[PDB]
C-alpha cells in the first residue's frame, strides 16, 4: 500500500517540508564548489557550436519540424521560465524544475520531455560545466539565433535544483485544464499567474475554452501583468515566438496519448506522451491537440505572424485534433505551408484564439499595427523581451555570468551603483557602532529598522534585501508594515551619523545609510546579548551600497511587501490564509529551516521588535534582554490560552488558577506550543540549560538574513 | 487555501522524501554532539526523585486517578514502545514518535497527551541530559517500583527524533479505529503490528467491535507475536499492566470529546480531547478499574479475572465491557476521584480472552499459583517491551543496566585476543586476494554480511558474522552453496593466520568478510585506473549460535536486494518501493543508493551472477558505464516477454539486443529526482566522483554496526 502522509489525515497541517528544504541541498552535488566558479571554465562559444548543429541534426524518435529543432527549443524556454510569478517570484527558469513534477507532466508541457531529452548528449559532454537551467534558455537563443534573430545577450549562473519547489501553491483545482480561479476573464484570484491549472499563461481555445478573443485578451493581459510583462512586451512575447513553428494536433490528445511522464510506464524511461501511432511519424504527431503553422516559413524570422494575422480575416472551426482554432477566411494562404514532414505536402496557416485575441483588443491591436509598421521596432521590443523573461528571476547583475552579458543593466535588474569612496576599516566599524548605540535610538529601534531593511529578500528570484536601502525609498518608506513616521525619525538619525562620519574622514572613506542600519542592528543584537551576560559579536561585512529612485522600479517592490511578518509580529487584516501559514511560506524566502524560525521568533520577542509596541508575545519581564523567556513562559502550564473577545487575531494568556490576564499574543507566536514539531523545538530551546544556545542560534540566524543578498560572498 | 502535493496527483509516485530524512537531521541540535555522551552527565537517581514526586503531586489541569499518575505512565510508556513492528524494526519507544502525528493523534493514545505534559517541568530542568524518549520509559518505571513492584533493570541511549518516521506504512485504511486488514481473527495482512488502523495492538471490546474473547485471542496473539513476544510474555504483560489502573468512558467520546491534537484550536497548545462538557474523564469509552487497589502491585487482577464468572455488558460510555456475576465484587473499588463514591471491577473483551482462550489459560493459571513466577515473567517481559528496539548492549547506558545479557539483545562475545595490526591487515588483505575467491565473490559475501543492518531498530550487520549461522546461511538470496564456498576458504585463510601468530593476536571471520570485500572493491577501482584506500576498522567479533535467536533473525530477511538485484516472487509492491524501504534501513540517501547500485553494477555482484543491469563489457571494473549505458537514447527498453520484473534494452537503429534489466535498475531512468542524480554520474568528467561516491557509501554500510565507535 502506501505509507501515508500526515497531510492526508490532516489537510491543514502546517506544511513545514517547505523550511525542511532549506536545511540541506539535495542531490549529490558537493557543497565545497561553486556553480558560478565551474560555469566560469565553461567555453560558452564551443555549447553554442554543438547546440547550432544539434538544430538541424534530426533524430529519428522524434523528428524535426521543416529539418529545424529550433521552434521546438524556443517553446521549451519560454515554458521553462514562463512560470515566473512577481508575487512570490516562484517559478521560471534558474532551477531548471520544468524537469521535475508537476511541472514536467503539465499537459502545458506536452513533449517538452522529448525536446529536454535532445539536449542530454550537449548536458553530458560538458557536465557541471553548464547546468540544465542555463543549458535549456542557452538552447533557446541558439534556436532563435540560427534562424536569422540576434539576441539582446545571455547569462549563466542558474543552478539546478535536485527536486521540485515544495513552496509553490498553483493552484486550486484538484484537476489539470479545469480552473476554479476566475469567474470573469480578467479577474484571476490574486497571487496565480495562470488562468486554468496546468497551463503556463492562458488556455490557447480561449476562456474556458470558448474561441471568445476579447475575452482571452483579459487573460492574456492579466496573466502576463503578473508575469511582470505589459502589453508591449507581450504583444512582442507572442508575436516573436509565435513566428517559428506550428501547433500539433494531428488527432485528439485525450484518447491518442499516453499518460504524461510521472504516470508513465518505467520503459519509457522519464518521457510521456506515448503517441498511438509511435512518436516517430512526425506526420501524427501531437501535443497541444490543435494543428498547423503561423507563418509561411516557420524556421525563419520575418514579419510572417504580424502579416498574417493583420492582414487576413479569420474563422474559428474545430481542428483535426477536435480544438477550437482559427483559419483564414481567404484562399490565398491554402497551402500556402509546406508539411512539417512529408516533402510532397502543402499546410494552410492557422491562428489560436490567443493570437486573435491580439488582433482584436484595441490596445493590442494598436502594438501590432505599429510593429507590422515598424519591423525594427519589433524586433528591437521583442530581443529585450525576450532577455528580460529569460533573466527576470536571476537577481541583480552581479549574478549574471559570461562572455555574453549585456553592458547595459535593465531596471528590472533592481542595479546598485558603485561605491566610489574607500570601505571602512575595523576601527572605524567599532567607531560607528558605540555611536549608534550612544545615540537616542533604543534597540528594538534599531533591530525593528534593520529587520525591515533585510527582510524584502526572497530566494526565490533573488530581489529585495538590505543591500541599496531601499527601505528609504518609495514604496518601503510608506508601507504601513514599516511605520513611516517612525521609520523616518530613526533613518533621520543615522543618516545624521553618516553625515558626521563622512565629514570627518581625511582620507576619501565614507560609509553608506545601507551599512549603517544594518551595523545598527548588529550592534542592538550584540547589546541585547550583553544585558543577558552574553559577549557575542556578529561578524559584519561593510560594502552595502545606497540605491537610489533611478536604480529603482518602485511599483515593481509591491511585490516584496510582507502580508505578515513574523518577527514584528505583524498580520494584515486582509489575509485569506491562517497567520501561521503565511509565516512560514515567508520565512521560506528567507531560506530559514524550522529550527532557525523558532529560534528567530523567540529570541526577537525577547528583544521585543514589535510593530506599533505592542506587546503581543513578549512574554518577559526585561525587554532587549535576549534570553529564551519566550518559551520558558510560552511552555508554562500554569497558562491557559484562549481566543481574545472581539480580536481577529488576539489571544489572551490566563494565570490557569486566578484568572488573570498575564500575556497576549497572536497565532504567530502560539504556533510554536502547538504544532508538534515546532513545540519539540520549543522545548529544547525552553530547558534549564539552553539559553546560551538560543542566543548563539538566534545571532546566526540573525547574521545569515542580514548577509542573504550579499552575492559577493556567494 | 494550500499548495497541492504531487503525492496528490501521482499516488504511486516513489516515496523519496523517507531517504530525504536520513539526509539531514531536523532539530536544533548540533550535528556534532552525541547523545550517550550527555546521557553519562545525568544523575538518573535524581531524575527518579523527581519522578517520584510527581506521582503524588496531582496537577489542576488533569486530576491524579486515585491520587497516583502511576497507571496513566505505565499506559504512555507501553503505548510508546507498543507500536514496535519485528518485520521492519520500525515504530516503538527509540524516538519518542509518539510526540509527532500521527502516533500522536491515534484514538487509542487519547489523554496521553496530558500524560507526557506532566512529564515537561522534568524534561526542562534536565534538558540534552535526558531525551523525551528515555524519560517516558523510566516514568513508566518508577511509576511501578513507587506502587511496590521492582523491575528488573532501565537503560538510556534512546536519541529523541524531531519529526516522524516517515517509513512506517501503518495500514491501509483510510480512517482511523477502522480495519480492512484481516477477514478472520489472526489472519492480518503480513507487515502490520495491530489489527485495526490506530490502535497499539488490537480493539479492547474485541474484533470488528464484537465481544468474543476466543476470537480476540486470535488477534491477540498474532500482533503480540508481529511485536516479538510470545505466549507467556504476552499474558504476564496485559496482566501486570492491567494490575495497575482504570479505563476511563464516562460517557460516549464520540460526542463528547473534541478534536484529536492534530485538529484540536491552536490555543489548546497541543493537547487535544477536550472534554466537551468524581472522574468525568473520558478517553476509550470503556470505564471501571481492573482490581480493588489500582495503585498497588499484587494478584487482583488475576484473581479478579480467574476466580469469577464474567459476563459482557454495555457501560456508560456505549462500549462492550465485562461485569462480573457476583455481588460480592459489587462496589469493591473506591472511585477515582469522588471519595464518597465505590466502584465495580470491570473487565476488557481482551482480558476474558486471556481466560477463554486454552493456552493462555493454562499460562494465567501457572501465574496464579505462583505471583513469583508471574512477577518475574513481568518483569523481564516489561524490560524486553521497553528496550528491544535499542540494539545490541553496547547502546544499553546508565547504572540501571542489568549485568545479565538478553537474548533479544543479539548479544556479542568478547575478543579474547590482540587485534591484528596495519601489516597484518595488508598482509590479510593480499592472502585474501591471493586466493581463488572473485572480486564478486568477495562483494557479494561482504555485501551479504553487512546488509541486514536496519536503523529502526539497530540489529543485524556485519560485526558477528552471522552471515554463516542458521538461518541468514541458508536464505535463499545468500546463495547457501556458493556462500560455503567463500566462507570455507576465508576460514582456512583465519585458522592458517591465527596458528602463524605468536603474540596472542587472532583475526575474526567477521573482520575478514569485511576486508575481503573492501580488498575487492580497491580492486575494482584499481582496474578503473583507481587508488582508493578504504579505511579499515578491526575488532568484529564471530557470534555463535548461542548468541543468536535464529528465528528472529528471519524478519530481518531481504525480498529485495537491490546491489546484488534479487527479487522474491511473492513481492506484492513494487519492486522499486522495497528496494527504497529497505534503504532507509540503511540511512542511505537517494544519491548513496543512486551511487551504490550504479557503481556496483560495473562490478557486477547478482544473485545467480546474471547480467540484469551490469550495463557494460568490463566487469569487475569500477566506472560510471552503468549511467552512461542506462541514459544512452540510442538505446530502447522494453517489458521482457513473460517476465515479472524483467526487460530488455534493444538498440533503437541496428534493433541490437544489448541488455537486461530489473525495474530496480531501471527506475534510476524513469524516476524524476533518481534520473537527474543519474545524469550527474552519467557525465563525460564525472566517474571520478562516482567512484568516491560508491567507496563513500560502501564504506558507511560496512561499520553501520560499529556502535563502539558511535
Ligand atoms: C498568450 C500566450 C501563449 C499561448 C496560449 C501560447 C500557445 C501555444 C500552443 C498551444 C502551442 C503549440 C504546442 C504544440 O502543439 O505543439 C504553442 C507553441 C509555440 N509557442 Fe506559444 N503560446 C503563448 C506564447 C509564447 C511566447 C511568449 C513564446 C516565445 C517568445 C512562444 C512560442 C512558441 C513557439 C516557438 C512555438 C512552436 C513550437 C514548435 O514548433 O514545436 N509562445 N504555443
Ligand atoms: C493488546 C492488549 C491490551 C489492550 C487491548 C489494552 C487496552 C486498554 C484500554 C482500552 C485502556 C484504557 C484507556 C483509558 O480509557 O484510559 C488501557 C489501560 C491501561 N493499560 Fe492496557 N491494554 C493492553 C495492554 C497493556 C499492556 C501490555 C500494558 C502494560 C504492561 C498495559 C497497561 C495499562 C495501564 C496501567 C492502564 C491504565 C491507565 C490508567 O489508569 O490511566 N496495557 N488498556
Known sequence: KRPKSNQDWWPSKLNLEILDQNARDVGPVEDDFDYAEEFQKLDLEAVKSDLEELMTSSQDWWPADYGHYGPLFIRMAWHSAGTYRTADGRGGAAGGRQRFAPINSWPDNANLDKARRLLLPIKQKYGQKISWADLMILAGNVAIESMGFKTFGYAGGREDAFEEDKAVNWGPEDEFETQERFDEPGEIQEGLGASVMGLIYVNPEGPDGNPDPEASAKNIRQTFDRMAMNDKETAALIAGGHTFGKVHGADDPEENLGPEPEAAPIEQQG????????????????????????????????????????????????????????????????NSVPDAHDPDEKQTPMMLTTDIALKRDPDYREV???????????????????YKLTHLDMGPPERFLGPEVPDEEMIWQDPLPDADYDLIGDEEIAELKEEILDSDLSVSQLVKTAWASASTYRDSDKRGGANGARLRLEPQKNWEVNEPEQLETVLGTLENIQTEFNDSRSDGTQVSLADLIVLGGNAAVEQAAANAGYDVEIPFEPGRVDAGPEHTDAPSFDALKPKVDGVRNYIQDDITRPAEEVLVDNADLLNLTASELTALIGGMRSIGANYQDTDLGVFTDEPETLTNDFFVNLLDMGTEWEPAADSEHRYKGLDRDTGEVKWEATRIDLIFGSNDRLRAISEVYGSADAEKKLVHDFVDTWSKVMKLDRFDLE
Not at 501590432?368 to 525576450?386: D, I, L, R, S
Open 271 to 334: 518521457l510521456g506522451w506515448q503517441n498511438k501511432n509511435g512518436n516517430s511519424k512526425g506526420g501524427e504527431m501531437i501535443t497541444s491537440g490543435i494543428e498547423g503553422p503561423w507563418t509561411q516559413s516557420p524556421t525563419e524570422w520575418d514579419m510572417g505572424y504580424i502579416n498574417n494575422l493583420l492582414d487576413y480575416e479569420w474563422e474559428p472551426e474545430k481542428g483535426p485534433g477536435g480544438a477550437w482554432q482559427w483559419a483564414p477566411k481567404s484562399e490565398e494562404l491554402k
Open 368 to 386: 501590432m499595427e505599429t510593429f507590422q509598421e515598424n519591423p525594427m521596432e519589433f524586433g528591437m521590443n521583442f530581443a529585450k523581451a525576450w
